[PDB]
Amino acid sequence: MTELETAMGMIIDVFSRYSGSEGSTQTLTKGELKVLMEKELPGFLQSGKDKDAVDKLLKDLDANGDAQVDFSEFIVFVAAITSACHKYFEKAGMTELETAMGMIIDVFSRYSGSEGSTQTLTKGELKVLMEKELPGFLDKDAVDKLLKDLDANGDAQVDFSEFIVFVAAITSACHKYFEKNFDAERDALNIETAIKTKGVDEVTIVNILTNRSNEQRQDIAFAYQRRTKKELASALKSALSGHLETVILGLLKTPAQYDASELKASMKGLGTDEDSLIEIICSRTNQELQEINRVYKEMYKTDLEKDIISDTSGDFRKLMVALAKGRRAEDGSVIDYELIDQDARDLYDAGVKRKGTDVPKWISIMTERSVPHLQKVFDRYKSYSPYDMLESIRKEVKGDLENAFLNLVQCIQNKPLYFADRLYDSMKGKGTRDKVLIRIMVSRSEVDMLKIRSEFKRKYGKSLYYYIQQDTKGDYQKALLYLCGGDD
């Protein structure tokens, strides 16, 4: 590694070391920030002057207002300190973090030249610095574009402020690309402590439980039961309230248990919550649905299919039953062109081409064929029809059957975008559709949350993190934010 590469890796490693001690590996908590400051920048925080120093520092660095310091905020802080130190050394004529900052300063000064009383890089100096310290980063004159991109004041040079801003940007890009020891007994002890603390320490409960995998939460529940002789979920049900309770109790169930309880809740009592039933049944895969069927009958002493049959009717019932069987053809990864064309033509003949609809044909095709096959089928279907599959569904059917078909085609085409749209709908208006938001954040945090976030940011222009921040507050908000995993 080059000296500059080594310094960047050192800054990343410092952040990683301190961010992993509690909560998320992606941010620093206030306590983590105080520890980092004491060990890596001793004396900068003048604690002893005031014991509130870290609160002020956190407020100063917390650009997005979530009471944590992610890597973007941390790296802009490190760059500001390094630039100030460069100017201080200029005007005047060791921990790991301090070492990395000093290394960046030394690297700049080893390629820089005198200009006025400052040290700057011309284009050629910048060229050689890039080729020797960041090999592979650099068009015939890509160094000129790099110069113009960094030259903020437009004086045809790169001073240290512009350089350190560039270094911060590329270190941040490396960390985010990397984004894109566990012990159950210790977790259980700390959770019991947080539960028995007067008033309940919900912050610790969230910090731990929303930053473990489902399997690790099962381990923690077993360790808690063995330590306490009481069930973790009952203790937390007693200790918590409201939406935070909903979130935590959902996280404590296995994926299949959670989906099964949500389906039962969608059918238990008068009427039906068709939106929830449709979301779960159309979005879940073969393996997920088979596990749901087993666990559902375990938990409720009846078949999920029998509950669906009892709660629904007509073609909507037919579609839901067929989908809930969870025996769609698996991705064969061998393309059946003849069947793609025949399925497309059948879908057209059954719907837009004729008066009425051959709904059983639609159901057979869209529940039995594999997902890649059906993606190709929808593209081919367009060749026959002036309306794509979704608009065809809107023109052909209505009510719960139409809703089910629309959701199903969306999950076949782009399931992350489906969930991004559902989340946006759950938050966009007044109040929150907390049931939907919680169910999606809990059920997809470990599945495709990165892709959901990417589609959400692409379509709506701000992050899923941001919308959660605006719609929810308190420990509930912080739990949902940890389940999202990061801003953008």
Partner 1 sequence: FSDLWKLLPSPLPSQAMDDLMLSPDDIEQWFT
Binding residues for Ca(2+): 25, 27, 32, 62, 64, 66, 68, 73, 118, 120, 125, 151, 153, 155, 157, 162
Strand partners, 118: 115
Single-letter residue type at 175: H
CA distance 158 to 155: 8
Picking from 85, 130, 78, the residue whose alpha carbon sits closest to that of residue 106 is: 85
Strand partners, 314: none
Q: Residue with structure tokens 């203790």? A: 235
- Closest to Ca ion by CB, 136 or 199: 199
In three-state form (DSSP H/G/I as H, E/B as E, the rest C), the secondary structure along 403-448 is: HHHHHHHHHHHHHHHHHHHHHHHHHHCCCCCHHHHHHHHHHHCCCC
Give the shortest CB-118-to-partner 1 separation in angstroms: 13
The pattern of x and - marking residues 177 through 206 that bind partner 1 according to CB under 8 A reads x-----------------------------
The structure tokens listed for 340 are 């793609």
Q: Which of residues 2-41 bind partner 1 (CB under 8 A)?
A: 5, 8
- Given Ca ion, partner 1, none, residue 299, with its beta carbon under 5 to 8 Å by kind, binds none
Give the shortest CB-168-to-Ca ion separation in angstroms: 16
Give the shortest CB-9-to-partner 1 separation in angstroms: 8
Near partner 1 by CB under 8 A, which window of 75-83, 282-290, 306-314, 446-454?
75-83
**Residue 197 burial (CB count, 10 A):** 13
The only residue of 32, 40, 162, 400 in contact with partner 1, by rule CB under 8 A? 162
CA distance 55 to 474: 18
Instruction: Tell me if 77 contacts partner 1 by CB under 8 A.
Output: yes
The only residue of 161, 266, 312, 385 in contact with partner 1, by rule CB under 8 A? 161
- Closest to partner 1 by CB, 85 or 189: 85
Give the shortest CB-50-to-partner 1 separation in angstroms: 14
Contacts of 49 (CB under 8 A, 6+ apart): none
Contacts of 231 (CB under 8 A, 6+ apart): 221, 224, 225
Instruction: Tell me if 272 contacts Ca ion by CB under 5 A.
Output: yes
* Residues 456, 464 contacting (CB under 8 angstroms): yes
The binding site for partner 1 (CB under 8 A) comprises 1, 5, 8, 43-44, 46, 60, 63, 72, 75-77, 79-81, 83-85, 87-88, 91-92, 134-137, 149-150, 152, 161-162, 164-166, 168-170, 172-174, 177
